[PDB]
Amino acid sequence: SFFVLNLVLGVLSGEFSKEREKAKARGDFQKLREKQQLEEDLKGYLDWITQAEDIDP
Amino acid sequence: ESARREVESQAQQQLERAKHKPVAFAVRTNVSYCGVLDEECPVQGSGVNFEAKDFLHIKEKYSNDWWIGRLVKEGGDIAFIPSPQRLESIRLKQEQKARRSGNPSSLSDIGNRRSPPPSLAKQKQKQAEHVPPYDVVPSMRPVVLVGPSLKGYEVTDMMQKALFDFLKHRFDGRISITRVTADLSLAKRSVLNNPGKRTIIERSSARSSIAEVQSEIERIFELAKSLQLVVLDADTINHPAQLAKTSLAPIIVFVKVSSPKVLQRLIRSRGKSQMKHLTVQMMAYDKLVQCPPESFDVILDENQLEDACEHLAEYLEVYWRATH
């Protein structure tokens, strides 16, 4: 029960790591990476537009 | 010969009694000439080897060969600067170091055709352009804000309005912000002896827009006599290509927005009415991005108003102490 569970967890973790390292070559992480910064600058530029309107002319 | 010793301290004494002597004019230099190689200076010592595109602001008129000015480095001191005629005169002397400086080659042909250097090999020729080594610049270098999109596009309008807001508050009593409408690109260094002196010429230039492209220079020079930074919002300056060699030579700030996809998002924030020049901004940003920075002396890379204000204020404050 404990040794067998350890073996199962180790094999599954190794397989998951291999699949992760094979799918990282495609670059699926880049799409998630590029999505975060595109959202960080979004509100950082929209608030600039918003408050500059209130400083009025 | 004790005469040289007497005149050695004469220049220093006059230049030290008054520490609050105002600056008269300013001049840019672009010649990498080592002033220490030649020991020709009124005061014995080693001069400053000024680099190209260095802003020298004159404040004295000593003689016709050398003058007195100041540089643009923090805690600046008093040094010597050669006259453009003196610099032009010594420019020809540099080529005299070589065996020949003209048509007659020394390819093992000596004593047959001496070919003394004519006026062609001297500085008399090359009068088609005759660019002086020294260029006249205002005492205070202006500032031009370019980007991140079309000037006056309701998105750039809100962009620099906040930037102009904090600038006129933090620098209160120290800044002068004005808006202009006339053209600025149609202005070169020298196109005629008397360009547009009279408005009753009735020619191809009488009805054109030349009495505003030039008249904004010396008018703003008087405003620059206070040595205060000047920023405008004209709808003409969209690339520093024409501002790199103009008389103004102002301060350009890079205000890029990083990704080009975000630009569409702020465009769609207001929805429609952005189709007038929407395709332009698809390339207008990229116009000042694919080109090398070079022109932008300082670059603003911040996605928020708060730290963007501190970036501009950081550069202005340090540059403020350079010419003082």
Beta-carbon separation of B266 and A49 below 8 A = yes
| Contact list, B304 vs chain A (CB under 8 Å) | 44, 47-48
C-alpha–C-alpha distance, residues B238 and B287, integer Å? 9
Beta-carbon separation of B303 and A47 below 8 A = no
C-alpha–C-alpha distance, residues B83 and B190, integer Å? 20
Contacts of B76 (CB under 8 A, 6+ apart): B70, B322, B323
Q: Are B239 and B147 in contact (CB under 8 A)?
A: no
Beta-carbon separation of B158 and A49 below 8 A = yes
C-alpha–C-alpha distance, residues B28 and B72, integer Å? 11
Contacts of B47 (CB under 8 A, 6+ apart): B35, B36, B41, B79, B80
Q: Are B197 and B114 in contact (CB under 8 A)?
A: no
Residue A52: CA count within 13 A, CB half-sphere: 23
Q: What share of chain A is helix, strand, coil (3-state, %, to 5)?
A: 85, 0, 15
Report the first-to-last Cα separation within chain B, whole angstroms. 38
**Dihedral angle sign, alpha carbons of residues B14, B18, B21, B27:** positive
Beta-carbon separation of A49 and B269 below 8 A = yes
C-alpha–C-alpha distance, residues B110 and B106, integer Å? 7
Q: Side chain identity at B307, as an amino acid letter?
A: D
Q: How many Cβ pairs within 8 Å bridge chains A and B?
A: 47
Give Cα separations from B67 to B43, B64, B101, B118, B179 (angstroms): 12, 8, 30, 31, 36
What three-state secondary structure class fits B257? coil
Sheet holding B66-70, edge to edge: B79-82, B66-70, B54-60, B26-29, B134-137
Beta bridge partners of B177: B231
C-alpha–C-alpha distance, residues B310 and B305, integer Å? 9
Q: Are B250 and B225 in contact (CB under 8 A)?
A: no
Q: Please name which of B87, B60, B127, B143 lies closest in space to residue B320, comparing C-alpha atoms.
A: B143
Beta-carbon separation of A55 and B161 below 8 A = yes
Q: Is A38 on the interface with B (CB under 8 A)?
A: yes
Q: Are B149 and B238 in contact (CB under 8 A)?
A: no
Instruction: Tell me how far apart the 2 most distant CA atoms of chain B are, in Å.
Output: 84
Show the CA angle centred on residue B16, arms to residues B15 and B20, nearest 5°.
90
Beta-carbon separation of A57 and B165 below 8 A = no
Q: Are B287 and B295 in contact (CB under 8 A)?
A: no
Beta-carbon separation of A52 and B257 below 8 A = no
| Contact list, B263 vs chain A (CB under 8 Å) | none
C-alpha–C-alpha distance, residues B270 and B267, integer Å? 6
Which of A38, A46, A47 shows the shortest C-beta gap to B259?
A38
Give Cα separations from B241 to B237, B238, B244, B246, B291 (angstroms): 9, 9, 6, 9, 10
Instruction: Tell me, letter by letter, the H, E, C secondary structure of B162-185.
Output: HHHHHHHHHCCCCCEECCCCCCCC
Which of A38, A46, A57 shows the shortest C-beta gap to B266?
A46
DSSP B137-158: E-SS--EEEE-SSSSSSSSHHH
C-alpha–C-alpha distance, residues B183 and B238, integer Å? 12
Q: Is A55 on the interface with B (CB under 8 A)?
A: yes
Give Cα separations from B75 to B18, B320, B324 (angstroms): 17, 11, 8
| Contact list, A57 vs chain B (CB under 8 Å) | 161
Q: Please name which of A26, A49, A45, A10 lies closest in space to residue B302, comparing C-alpha atoms.
A: A45
Q: Side chain identity at B193, as an amino acid letter?
A: N
C-alpha–C-alpha distance, residues B207 and B240, integer Å? 28
Q: Are B122 and A11 in contact (CB under 8 A)?
A: no
Q: Which residues of B117-129 are buried (b: 16+ CB within 10 A; e: fewer)?
A: eeeebeeeeeeee
Beta-carbon separation of A48 and B259 below 8 A = no
- Both structure tokens of B277: 């020049």
